């Protein structure tokens, strides 16, 4: 009767995915849900605020593992998570996205013959030097079920020999999350007030990819470009903590004072800020999809994206950070554009289709 | 001129590394560093190979072993990453498909260090095996893939890995057998010491987890060997996990009904394999080695990765379901030979491999 579904989460974006799938498994007939928090994101504004605001039950476990190397974080999460799998003996392990926590969770489980489902599977940058590309490839190939959010993602899995019958195109659970919590965002978040921002009276930015923040010249191009954009249209920038650290370390911390820079915000503020932005500048996977949700034009500050449908649809645009002034003009040019009318990422019921496919198989 | 670091951990890894390291020591300017994970630590599992096979002492002994998948893999991951940051090698070489192989590849790849997999692309199609996971994830984590067979090339192509990263080089274990054959013949008295002549016994090894971790499959095997022994002597160098399982299950007494040894060194092993009437094994290398010597083999498994041995009739699977049948199969196959065919290359897989590591850029 009770299938036990154990969820491994470690990062902000995973807490948000999980909140959509938890909601649905909670009120599932005879499903017990166990939640493990790897500890990867520990700070109040990267972790706790999402459990509080998205009504996610307290983790059954917090492994408290974070802030080391790839080897340390992964290695220990592997040992710790196995310890919990041995105690809890679940029927399914679900992993999310593509961090070291995703891979450690999966790898812990497959070695115990515990089935593994990958929520958000089959995405590819085709840059194998990226640690996130390796995590998603190794995760997909270790899983038993692959919950694809797009047709591209499905073709990507088929191309690497993974069979039809283990792939389910379910759309994106982060679209579910945006539907379920938008109202709560309306009636709780006053961030437009607190910042004194008029709706569609600003540009919203996030930047945290390692290929953008570890490289001084890239990080400088971006912060220069955003400060120019701000002269013309205010830039709001909840600054990822690693990004903050890197810009302080290379002596770029002044460009952050020259825009409206914030510590990281919870999901409800973020929804509000995203919704009411004239345009969104990001290097985030989640934020670029979210821009499309609200039909706000987007610029992706990378050489590629895994979300190729947003480019085809013209809601999203690549601007690699080679030149501060070029990137500024690209941003400012794109804010009076829009994309075509199209429905991606499903019906807002990816989580429920996932719940269903898990009680059958 | 270029630094190549090897991660070995267990007996079959030392035998493969031996062949390759012999070629690399000849190569102009190539420094080798050798990391022994600690996975095998008994002297007749580790030390003996280093001595008889002329392998320089490991540059590092991490001393990890005896734990779960989680524990070993995790601790190895962190530890190898430690060495790799110290040694900053240009290449990491990983062999076969133990937990050490995988910790090796994962440590290396998150550090942007090229990984070459010796013995790449083999597939059991059984994901319950820890070792199937191991080679799948290793192959997907590698930049070079030294495949030993045309099957393994095909296996890799079907999982989306490009032709340009796959090289069919043959098997370094044939290079091994070839180079150490005269030495084993000259130095091994294993026959004298046991009181055996040629062709007047049967050699057996068993250590798969799937065979040893399950009481009833192990009983089947031990009883079937005990029966065969009544008809033709059975010589059984017993893996320590296999002995420790036999003791914990009460099945110790079966090992008196055969010629049970402690594990032997490569030199004694060659002589045993060479002069056997039939080999019965759940081992990877031993299957191939039985064909090296034109000795019929029986593989006490549900599948093998070495499928060409079945097609050429050198080998024959016999899953352990029934003591009486397993014994019968074993005795029947004594009367068979395979077809004359060359497999596994010309004995210079190690040179091809060295050649590729140097001229890769
Ligand atoms: C490039 C890359 O690999 N990315 C992977 C990465 O996600 P990601 O890039 O989106 O990181 P991230 O931007 O922190 O999260 C966004 C969320 O935070 C919210 N968000 C953002 C900022 C903020 O201040 N407050 C806030 O609530 C936003 O509203 C939004 O909902 O980790 C994910 C994970 O493992 O699950 C993978 O699915 C991704 N893989 C892909 C392919 O997109
Ligand atoms: C089933 C499986 O995955 N197997 C993998 C496994 O090796 P394996 O199954 O062959 O274990 P194993 O039999 O201990 O050693 C054989 C050698 O020991 C010598 N040997 C054996 C017994 C003895 O007493 N003395 C001795 O010298 C023999 O002469 C012989 O040369 O780990 C390997 C590794 O990671 O490198 C993978 O390459 C293998 N994958 C394959 C695909 O064969
Ligand atoms: C999951 C994994 O990596 N499996 C590999 C491992 O099997 P193997 O059976 O050796 O797996 P482990 O390395 O986990 O060792 C199993 C157990 O054997 C005992 N032990 C081990 C080594 C030793 O010197 N003394 C001793 O007593 C310990 O109790 C240990 O836990 O190496 C074999 C080589 O022979 C390979 O065929 C297997 O693919
Ligand atoms: O709660 C948190 C999470 C992360 N970080 C910082 O942000 C970095 C992000 O690294 P993490 O391992 O979390 O993410 P990855 O880059 O591996 O996806 C960490 O190293 C820390 O410097 C932080 O300050 N607080």
Give B36-91 as a DSSP string. Answer: E-SS--STTTTHHHHHHTTPPPPSEE----SS-HHHHHHHHHHHHHHHHHHH--SE
Distance from residue B40's CA to the centre of ligand 3 (Å): 7
As a whole number of angstroms, the distance between CA A106 and CA A115 comes to 9
- Complete DSSP assignment for B127-148: TTSHHHHHHHHHHHH-SEEEES
Q: Which residues of A touch B73 (CB under 8 A)?
A: 75, 78, 107, 111
Q: How many Cβ atoms are within 10 Å of A333's Cβ, its own excluded?
A: 13
As a whole number of angstroms, the distance between CA B308 and CA B335 comes to 20
In degrees, rounded to 5, the angle at the alpha carbon of residue A296 between the alpha carbons of residues A293 and A300 is 95
Q: Give the resolution to one decimal, in Å.
A: 2.2
Tell me the residue ranges of DSSP E strands in chain B.
Answer: 2-8, 30-36, 60-61, 91-95, 115-118, 144-147, 166-168, 202-205, 234-237, 259-261, 278-281, 297-299
User: CB–CB of B140/B133 below 8 Å?
Assistant: no
Token reading at B232: 């033709």
In the CATH scheme, what is the homologous superfamily, with its name and number, of domain A181-335?
Answer: Glycogen Phosphorylase B; (3.40.50.2000)
Token reading at A35: 């939640």
Q: Minimal CA–CA distance to A281: which of A335, A219, A322, A231? A: A335
User: CB–CB of B151/B333 below 8 Å?
Assistant: no
Start-to-end CA span in chain A (Å):
14
Residue B318 CB less than 6 A away from ligand 2 = no
Pairing status of strand A167-169 against strand A145-148: parallel
> Do the Cβ atoms of A141 and B140 come within 8 Å?
yes
In degrees, rounded to 5, the angle at the alpha carbon of residue A335 between the alpha carbons of residues A334 and A336 is 90
B299 bridge partner residues: B281, B317
Distance from residue A99's CA to the centre of ligand 4 (Å): 11
Task: For the domain made up of A3-180+346-360, give the CATH fold.
Answer: Rossmann fold (3.40.50)
Give the up-direction half-sphere exposure of residue B42: CA atoms within 13 A in the CB hemisphere.
13
CATH match for B2-178+345-359 among 1.10.260.40, 3.50.50.60, 3.40.50.2000, 3.30.1050.10: 3.40.50.2000
Q: Which ligand is nearest to the CA of A50?
A: 1
User: CB–CB of A38/A10 below 8 Å?
Assistant: yes
Interface of B with A in 29-58 (CB under 8 A): none
Token reading at A298: 């987007």
Residue A306 CB less than 6 A away from ligand 1 = yes
As a whole number of angstroms, the distance between CA B98 and CA B40 comes to 11
> Do the Cβ atoms of A141 and B141 come within 8 Å?
no
* Domains A3-180+346-360 and A181-335 belong to one CATH topology: yes
Cβ contacts of residue B304 below 8 Å, gap of 6+? B124, B284, B287, B310, B315, B317
Q: Minimal CA–CA distance to B318: which of B338, B301, B340, B335? A: B301
As a whole number of angstroms, the distance between CA A144 and CA A118 comes to 8
Q: Which residues of A touch B92 (CB under 8 A)?
A: none
In degrees, rounded to 5, the angle at the alpha carbon of residue A326 between the alpha carbons of residues A322 and A328 is 110
Whether the CA torsion B175, B176, B179, B181 is positive or negative: it is negative
A111 close contact with B: CB closer than 8 A? yes
- Complete DSSP assignment for A2-39: -EEEEEEE-SHHHHHHHHHHHHHHHTSTTEEEEEEE--
As a whole number of angstroms, the distance between CA A30 and CA A34 comes to 13
Rounded alpha-carbon distances, angstroms, from residue B339 to A185, B174, B198, B309, B343: 73, 18, 22, 10, 11
User: CB–CB of A299/A264 below 8 Å?
Assistant: no
Reply yes or no on domain B179-334 having CATH 3.40.50.2000.
yes
Nearest CA, atom 25, ligand 1? A265
As a whole number of angstroms, the distance between CA B71 and CA B63 comes to 13
Is-catalytic flag, A333? no
**In chain A, which residue ranges form alpha helices assigned H by DSSP?**
12-26, 49-53, 70-88, 100-110, 131-142, 151-159, 173-188, 191-195, 210-213, 216-232, 241-249, 253-257, 267-275, 285-293, 308-312, 324-334, 350-360
Question: A88 by DSSP, 3-state: which?
Answer: helix
Interface of B with A in 155-184 (CB under 8 A): 158-161
What technique solved it?
Answer: X-ray
Q: Minimal CA–CA distance to A205: which of A280, A308, A274? A: A280
Give domain limits for chain B: 2-178+345-359, 179-334
As a whole number of angstroms, the distance between CA A114 and CA A93 comes to 7
Whether the CA torsion A289, A292, A296, A301 is positive or negative: it is positive
Closest ligand 3 atom to Cα of B46: 24
Mutation choice for B interface testing from A8, A68, A73, A79 by most B CBs within 10 A: A79
As a whole number of angstroms, the distance between CA A161 and CA B116 comes to 21
Length of chain B: 361
Token reading at B262: 């402690």
As a whole number of angstroms, the distance between CA A20 and CA A240 comes to 23
Q: Minimal CA–CA distance to B241: which of B293, B205, B187? A: B205
> Do the Cβ atoms of A129 and B111 come within 8 Å?
no
Q: Which residues of A188-197 are buried (b: 16+ CB within 10 A; e: fewer)?
A: ebebbeeeeb
């Amino acid at each position: 009767m009770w299938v036990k579904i154990l969820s491994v989460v470690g990062a902000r974006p995973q807490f948000i995915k999980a909140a959509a799938v938890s909601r649905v498994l909670r009120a599932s007939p005879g499903v017990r849900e166990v939640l493990v928090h790897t500890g990867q994101h520990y700070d109040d504004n990267m972790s706790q605020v999402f459990f509080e605001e998205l009504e996610i039950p307290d983790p059954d476990y917090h492994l408290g593992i974070g802030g080391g190397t790839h080897g340390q974080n992964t290695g220990r999460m592997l040992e710790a998570i196995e310890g919990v799998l041995l105690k809890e003996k679940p029927d399914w392990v679900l992993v999310y996205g593509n961090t070291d926590s995703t891979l450690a969770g999966a790898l812990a489980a497959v070695k115990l013959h515990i089935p593994v489902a990958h929520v958000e599977a089959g995405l590819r940058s085709f840059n194998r030097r990226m640690p996130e590309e390796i995590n998603r490839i190794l995760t997909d190939h270790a899983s038993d079920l692959l919950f694809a959010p797009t047709e591209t993602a499905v073709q990507n899995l088929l191309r690497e020999g993974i069979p039809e019958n283990r792939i389910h195109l379910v759309g994106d659970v982060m679209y579910d999350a945006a539907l379920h919590y938008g109202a709560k965002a309306e009636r709780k978040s006053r961030i437009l007030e607190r910042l004194g921002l008029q709706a569609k009276g600003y540009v919203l930015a996030t930047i945290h990819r390692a290929e953008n923040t570890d490289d001084q010249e890239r990080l400088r191009v971006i912060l220069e470009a955003l400060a120019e954009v701000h002269q013309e249209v205010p830039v709001v920038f909840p600054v990822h903590p690693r990004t903050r650290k890197r810009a302080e370390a290379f002596g770029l911390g002044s460009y952050l004072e020259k825009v409206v820079a914030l510590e990281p915000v919870g999901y409800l503020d973020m929804v509000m800020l995203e919704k009411n932005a004239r345009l969104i500048v990001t290097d985030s996977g989640g934020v670029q999809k979210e821009a499309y949700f609200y039909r706000v034009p987007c610029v992706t500050v990378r050489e590629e994206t895994e979300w190729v449908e947003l480019l085809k649809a013209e809601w999203n645009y690549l601007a690699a950070p080679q030149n501060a002034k070029d990137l500024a003009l690209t941003i400012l040019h794109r804010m009076r554009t829009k994309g075509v009318e199209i429905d991606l990422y499903g019906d807002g019921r990816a989580s429920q289709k996932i719940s269903d496919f898990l009680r059958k198989v």
